[PDB]
């Protein structure tokens, strides 16, 4: 029987470890799409993340480093963050992780050999391994209709293998619109110039059409800290008349991760997103207002981590999800995890990975798993000493809805 | 319902610690006996397992340090084995325990304030002190009728108060007939040369004189590595035709504690007794063919332990009692009063205090019972975990036979 | 490759309580010898082991004991030992360990209802049980010829099913030759007053009748803390001149389990004996002198096992096996394992559980493998922070090797 916080320990850290993950937000792609599914040490150095760090560090302009070859930025940021300076960043840490992971060794620092072991495998084969090492059952994508490259691949057939869901991803439909509704009409949605019937309805059809195409467990949307709802403007309007009543209709949760302010250093591309404090108003309308619709929000901001909480306290039909970017570091995830716990119990998503290059599903899961291992230990403990009975089983139970069942509950899957 | 290791932990310690002592051997002294009852830190530093120590590293000659005044071998004592290097030894730690109990600062190392808090009070002061402290209830005496002091108070009639009891010591008697019965016979005892009725008659006369001025709780010995039994000698021809009868008659039982070898190094005085291992023959001799007398036995041999309580499984007539002399030290304490329990239960006596110094019932207690107090924390875990639900009564309960009513039990008081 | 303390005790537990045992010494016997099988919770509590604990405690004389029936015997060591006082001791422990496994709730202390469980079942059901429970694939049993009630069975064609063994038990042979040499007689062995070439062959012809009867993994016998070799005795001369020639020739090892001293209290019956030390000599002797024989070796003093691990160093052909009846308690099986694992790496064979009574296969291994995981734990662990790797097949080999594959390996089977 489990009677003390050592036999806990070992209960709890064992069943998170043996607990099979479905990561519900990442930016990976089911292998048959292709190269767009990043992998390899060249790719995990090169991670965005990784950008931002080593321009802290070296003198190569950012001109200079976007020219050099995939293999050459590697070179400079191995030798900028792991050779000149310990690697003690999350991201960097991150990437040893997933060396040792795999079965190669940080301790001698050939990266010569490391990439030795990625040039001896397919894509399909890799992303066994590491399923298999992250222990992770289901893989989420992040599926942009707007992007050219992925459009046409859903447009010409392709479809994930049973591992891989898709989500709807809708930034540049809600958050662009006058750029974008050119583009519907390209493709033959008939939005006019004025916000009208046709409008509305040519809107609807086009996220119906999409809903078709790729079964999506959610339609997500990433938004500024100013976001505000509700609000007489395209964004406004288009969830209000049409994400809204489709979303309700097919029974799809609305995912909205709030905090991101676009583009503040452009020249650093995809590092060159900040973050900002967002008002719960709007949130805290849509969830009020519409009952039946579902929303999983994540925030990016620090400042907001503990009303989110408290929100999740007042509406069912919100589920929070994971520590977020700025967020997904140590210190934070264990704060946020554990105000999460304290006010919600197990009714919440403790984290996703946001994986961009294949092998971080590694080191997301692992350095993410210790963390939530800790607090439920704490936790577990906190009301066995309270004279609680609490069962390998129940545990069992609780780990599965923290890292996959809440998820799949919620989208109705 | 002690729902966790955690809270048994502390169930069990305070059990321990609130449960009164009846110490069954020590060598303390009612106080209305006089000044063979040692007390204050002179004597605590002088007690001879220091000695024995600081002449491990002290220039000081032997025959100097018996020369020197109580004061003077204290400061000696406490400036090699305190300060030249630290106290880490048993004996050491011991007398830091005390000074802390009694209310005292070790961290000033203020000998001379120490002293000072001794010479405030009446030998009566600080028995009611230290008893208080150790929570000792009932103290049980070495009373050798043999030494001319201690003989003096018993001719005078003194009696000790309530929280004192007597043990009929015969260690000259059983082990220097040939000297001491010349001694006999200046009493009145008229002892031949020829060990006939007249003698045996003679002796156990001695022996009930004895048991009828101190109504001791125990006759008692302490015999070499190598006591056998039957012997033609005069310590089995005593043990056989008189003790054991006389024991008998009265149920008083009989304590050998067997396994020391006197003064292997004359000079250290009390400090030179060594140890031997002793052959278990004559004690299964005893407990067999004397199955109405009843025997406390300890031995002081740590190759004699393991033995000693497979010999208690096999016959109800042996008690056997504490961690003797080299034998009181954590790591025996520890190994022995498990390898007890494992093999007896709860039917035994785990630890005496030996205390030559009225101060030492402080430490040798509180040592005692924190190992003590682990041994039963991990035995009632095992039963937990096996599915068996112990309650705070019954913990008091077995705490009570093991640390007093054990005895009381066997010596049928 | 374990990363981690934790993924290395999750595998190291997981391997060990899943290696399925073989005991290779125990006094059970295949179901289908009948009552000799003894099971049940009343068997389980009036097994010798707590008879000589509630002599202890019980004013109920031994004679008055014996003379109840086996149903009061097992409600008096159930009061005395298990409600008067907390059963603590290892053996009481046992049973409570038996009772849980099976289903039953020790909570409720109703021995009423756990005698109900056994009563509606049949001796082959239980053993498919216990053996289930307790994952043993195979036992070794102690078979004695010249116990009437044994023998019978194996005169009448009995055989053990496959998951029984057979040991033939020589200690009448042995240890009373003189009382022995009749019973020979009577079955047609023409063994002289003497020992002549007629009587080593007769006594040779005997242990061949029933090497060929039983087909034995081995012979065996339990000898005395005096137990020497050469030895002008009858036992000295018929190991010499008879055992070891028919064990070279057979290639079956002979098992000494030295040590025991019989009957030191008659009327305890089977809990009646005590222990001493052996000299290693005789031991010593055989291992050397006899290369193509093969030893299997276990002591009862807890002073002969350091030595006889060294021994072990010394010679291929000795096999020292479990930790065995006064040796099997926690304390003492912990400090021999580890000497062994130290010493011997894992050429040695930790356990056997002696059982008496079915079930108890069910606490001696879950007892014991708790404490030979916790060594092994700590033995991988610190090779693994020298730097080496272990995978799980390694360690679920070695955890095969020392709870069966050391055996099945040295008796050549
Ligand atoms: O790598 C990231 O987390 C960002 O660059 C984005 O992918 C963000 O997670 C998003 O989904 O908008
Ligand atoms: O202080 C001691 O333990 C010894 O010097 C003796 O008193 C011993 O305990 C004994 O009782 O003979
Ligand atoms: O139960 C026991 O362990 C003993 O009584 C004997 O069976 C001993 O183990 C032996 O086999 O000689
Ligand atoms: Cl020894
Ligand atoms: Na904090
Ligand atoms: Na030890
Ligand atoms: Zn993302
Ligand atoms: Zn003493
Ligand atoms: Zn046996």
């Known amino acids: 029987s489990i009677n003390s916080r050592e036999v806990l320990a070992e209960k709890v850290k064992n069943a998170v470890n043996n607990q099979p993950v479905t990561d519900m937000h990442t930016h990976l792609f089911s292998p048959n799409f292709g190269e767009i599914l990043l992998w390899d040490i060249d790719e995990l150095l090169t991670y965005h993340y990784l950008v931002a760090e080593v321009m802290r560090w070296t003198d190569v302009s950012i001109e200079a480093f976007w020219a050099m070859s995939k293999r050459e930025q590697a070179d400079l940021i191995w030798e900028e963050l792991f050779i000149k300076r310990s690697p003690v960043s999350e ?39 590491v399923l298999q090492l992250a222990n992770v059952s289901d893989v989420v994508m992040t599926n942009d209709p707007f992007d050219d490259n992925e459009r046409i691949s859903w447009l010409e057939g392709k479809q994930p293998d049973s591992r891989f869901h898709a989500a709807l991803r809708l930034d540049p439909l809600l958050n662009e619109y006058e750029q974008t509704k050119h583009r519907l009409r390209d493709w033959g949605y008939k939005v006019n110039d004025e916000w009208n019937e046709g409008s509305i309805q040519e809107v609807k059809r086009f996220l119906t059409d999409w809903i078709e195409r790729m079964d999506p467990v959610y339609m997500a949307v990433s938004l500024p800290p100013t976001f505000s709802f509700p609000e007489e403007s395209n964004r406004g309007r288009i969830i209000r008349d ?67 909480v408290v929100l999740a306290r007042k509406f069912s039909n919100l589920m929070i999800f994971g520590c977020w970017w700025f967020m997904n570091n140590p210190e934070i995830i264990n704060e946020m995890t554990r105000m ?41 403990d906190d009301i066995l000493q309270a004279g609680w009975e609490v069962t390998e089983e129940e545990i069992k139970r609780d780990v599965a809805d923290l890292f996959s069942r809440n998820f799949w509950r919620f989208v109705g899957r």
């Not at 060396?99 to 894509?123: C, H, I, M, N, W």
């Open 340 to 380: 999460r716990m304290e006010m919600l119990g197990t009714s919440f998503i403790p984290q996703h990975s946001d994986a961009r290059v294949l092998e971080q599903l590694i080191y997301k899961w692992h350095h993410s798993k210790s963390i939530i291992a800790e607090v439920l230990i704490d936790k577990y």
């Open 91 to 129: 991201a960097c840490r991150g990437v040893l992780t997933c060396l040792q992971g795999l079965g190669l060794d940080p301790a001698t620092r050939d990266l010569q050999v490391y990439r030795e072991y990625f040039a001896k495998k397919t894509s399909e084969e890799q992303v066994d391994t």
């Open 242 to 308: 049409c994400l809204l009543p489709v979303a309700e209709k097919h029974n799809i949760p609305f995912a909205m991760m709030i905090g991101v302010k676009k583009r503040v250093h452009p020249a650093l591309g995809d590092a060159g997103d900040f973050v900002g404090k967002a008002s719960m108003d709007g949130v805290e309308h849509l969830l009020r207002e519409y009952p039946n619709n579902k929303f999983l929000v994540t925030m990016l901001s620090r400042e907001n981590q503990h009303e989110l």
